[PDB]
Amino acid sequence: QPEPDMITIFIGTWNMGNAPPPKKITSWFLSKGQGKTRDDSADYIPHDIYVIGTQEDPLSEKEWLEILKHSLQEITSVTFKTVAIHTLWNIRIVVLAKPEHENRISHICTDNVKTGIANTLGNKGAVGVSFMFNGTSLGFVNSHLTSGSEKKLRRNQNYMNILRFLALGDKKLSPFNITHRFTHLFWFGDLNYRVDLPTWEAETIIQKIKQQQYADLLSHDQLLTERREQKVFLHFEEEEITFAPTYRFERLTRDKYAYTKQKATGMKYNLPSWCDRVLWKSYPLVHVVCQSYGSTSDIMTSDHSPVFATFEAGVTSQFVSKNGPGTVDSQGQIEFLRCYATLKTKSQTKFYLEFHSSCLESFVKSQEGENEEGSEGELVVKFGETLPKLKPIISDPEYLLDQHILISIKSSDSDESYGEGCIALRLEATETQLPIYTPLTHHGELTGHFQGEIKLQTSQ
Ligand SMILES: Oc1ccc(CN2CCc3ccccc3C2)cc1
Ligand SMILES: Oc1ccc(CN2CCc3ccccc3C2)cc1
Ligand SMILES: Oc1ccc(CN2CCc3ccccc3C2)cc1
């Protein structure tokens, strides 16, 4: 059996509204309903990996796993294997995979983050799973963020707490948060961002939904506007939304949105909103294509409709050579020329770089850069030609061109990262000086840039 170079991944997010599901939920896993839906001709073709995120989930783990497995069994005639299940309060993540992948999956990690403080600690937060699939690292986050139209800034703070504190992936990547640890990271959930229009416009909104005219509503979606203004989810992608708002429905139908203020809502309006979302972030120049993004129309036990998204995702093979793993391949090298960082810092410490990659035996520390004052105030940290020559473990171009180098710029005084980024080795040419670039972030916010030239030598 050849190792795959692509897999398909199903992502589901459903806020179940504390109610048991209906007897049939197969439409969710088939990507059928409204939006970008899956072709009927693919119904019997299993995805490689199913990742199910629930919020307000009233079921036990056993009860939900039996429903999920029996659903997929009916659709595909495949008995899926449980990779991981993790629950925080009523927030849950399940990862299922084809049985043929059991030996391809390793380094399974789970974690959760509880958001907020006192009053605001005890039901919101996130759960996550990571693992390796052959040579590819995969991360998955299911978050239930703070509710309420007037709490977008709290949701943004919940996001930053989750990506700072969720401990997934390779712990050796100590300067890096989850936004840099994975070849592919999927972040989904009841993110709770709302369509920010006046309360008086509720019936106008409903009209627009009935006309399938989502444009004037999406222009006020808080997640899209906060992303455009770089307030949250920096460097994540979302597929275009072409389905109706998934919240807040009257239960047992999808014919009615329940938006008006009630004691049960804390006297808050719930204008129709796209609360339930799937976003992703993949390393540069790795294949990732969204092939469905939509909501079901026939699952009506909750005041939310389930959301689905599916992806093609590039994967690589667990490379063995005569040499690496367990030695270098003197044939291979990575050289850096004319490199500098630009930092948005008022500090004047010296800085050095660390280079982290699973193509290295271990991470490499550079010498200190030369600080220069940027013409518009910034700090320019010059490395020129001084950066180390990296010695990959395998020099075969079929391996090396698929790799990535994580970069952290650290203070010499404190050894704290001021910025993290990633460079693809998927170059247009080898043995050729070529421009490289990454933005640098810390705690998920932009802190600067790294740029220069690279020179990659492979065995070919
Ligand atoms: O080649 C690229 C360059 C920039 C982006 C990031 N995008 C750009 C547009 C946009 C609009 C609204 C909210 C977020 C974003 C983020 C993606 C690909
Ligand atoms: O107020 C200023 C006046 C001159 C410079 C010029 N330097 C020179 C070298 C260099 C190397 C790498 C990146 C940038 C630069 C810019 C910068 C700021
Ligand atoms: O450590 C170095 C890194 C890059 C360069 C080459 N470039 C970088 C950009 C720039 C901008 C403005 C004036 C000059 C330059 C010189 C030189 C030294």
From Swiss-Prot:
Gene Ontology biological process terms, A to Z: apoptotic process; determination of adult lifespan; immunoglobulin mediated immune response; intracellular signal transduction; negative regulation of B cell proliferation; negative regulation of bone resorption; negative regulation of interleukin-6 production; negative regulation of monocyte differentiation
Domains: entry comment: The SH2 domain interacts with tyrosine phosphorylated forms of proteins such as SHC1 or PTPN11/SHP-2. It competes with that of GRB2 for binding to phosphorylated SHC1 to inhibit the Ras pathway. It is also required for tyrosine phosphorylation. The NPXY sequence motif found in many tyrosine-phosphorylated proteins is required for the specific binding of the PID domain.
Family as reported in the entry's similarity comment: Belongs to the inositol 1,4,5-trisphosphate 5-phosphatase family.
Spans through the membrane: none
Record's function text: Phosphatidylinositol (PtdIns) phosphatase that specifically hydrolyzes the 5-phosphate of phosphatidylinositol-3,4,5-trisphosphate (PtdIns(3,4,5)P3) to produce PtdIns(3,4)P2, thereby negatively regulating the PI3K (phosphoinositide 3-kinase) pathways. Able also to hydrolyzes the 5-phosphate of phosphatidylinositol-4,5-bisphosphate (PtdIns(4,5)P3) and inositol 1,3,4,5-tetrakisphosphate. Acts as a negative regulator of B-cell antigen receptor signaling.
Gene designation: INPP5D
Tissue expression per record: Specifically expressed in immune and hematopoietic cells. Expressed in bone marrow and blood cells. Levels vary considerably within this compartment. Present in at least 74% of immature CD34+ cells, whereas within the more mature population of CD33+ cells, it is present in only 10% of cells. Present in the majority of T-cells, while it is present in a minority of B-cells (at protein level).
Keywords (A to Z) from UniProt: Apoptosis, Cell membrane, Cytoplasm, Cytoskeleton, Hydrolase, Immunity, Lipid metabolism, Membrane, Phosphoprotein, Repeat, SH2 domain, SH3-binding
Tagged with keyword Cell membrane: yes
Known partners and oligomeric status: Interacts with tyrosine phosphorylated form of SHC1. Interacts with tyrosine phosphorylated form of DOK1. Interacts with tyrosine phosphorylated form of DOK3. Interacts with tyrosine phosphorylated form of SLAMF1/CD150. Interacts with PTPN11 in response to IL-3. Interacts with receptor EPOR. Interacts with receptors MS4A2/FCER1B and FCER1G. Interacts with receptors FCGR2B and FCGR3. Interacts with receptor FCGR2A, leading to regulate gene expression during the phagocytic process. Interacts with GRB2. Interacts with PLCG1. Interacts with tyrosine kinases SRC and TEC. Interacts with c-Met/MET.
Major location (coarse): cytoplasm
A GO MF label: inositol-polyphosphate 5-phosphatase activity
Protein name stated in the entry: Phosphatidylinositol 3,4,5-trisphosphate 5-phosphatase 1
Modification after translation (UniProt): Tyrosine phosphorylated by the members of the SRC family after exposure to a diverse array of extracellular stimuli such as cytokines, growth factors, antibodies, chemokines, integrin ligands and hypertonic and oxidative stress. Phosphorylated upon IgG receptor FCGR2B-binding.
GO cellular component, one term: membrane raft
Compartment annotation: Cytoplasm; Cell membrane; Membrane raft; Cytoplasm, Cytoskeleton
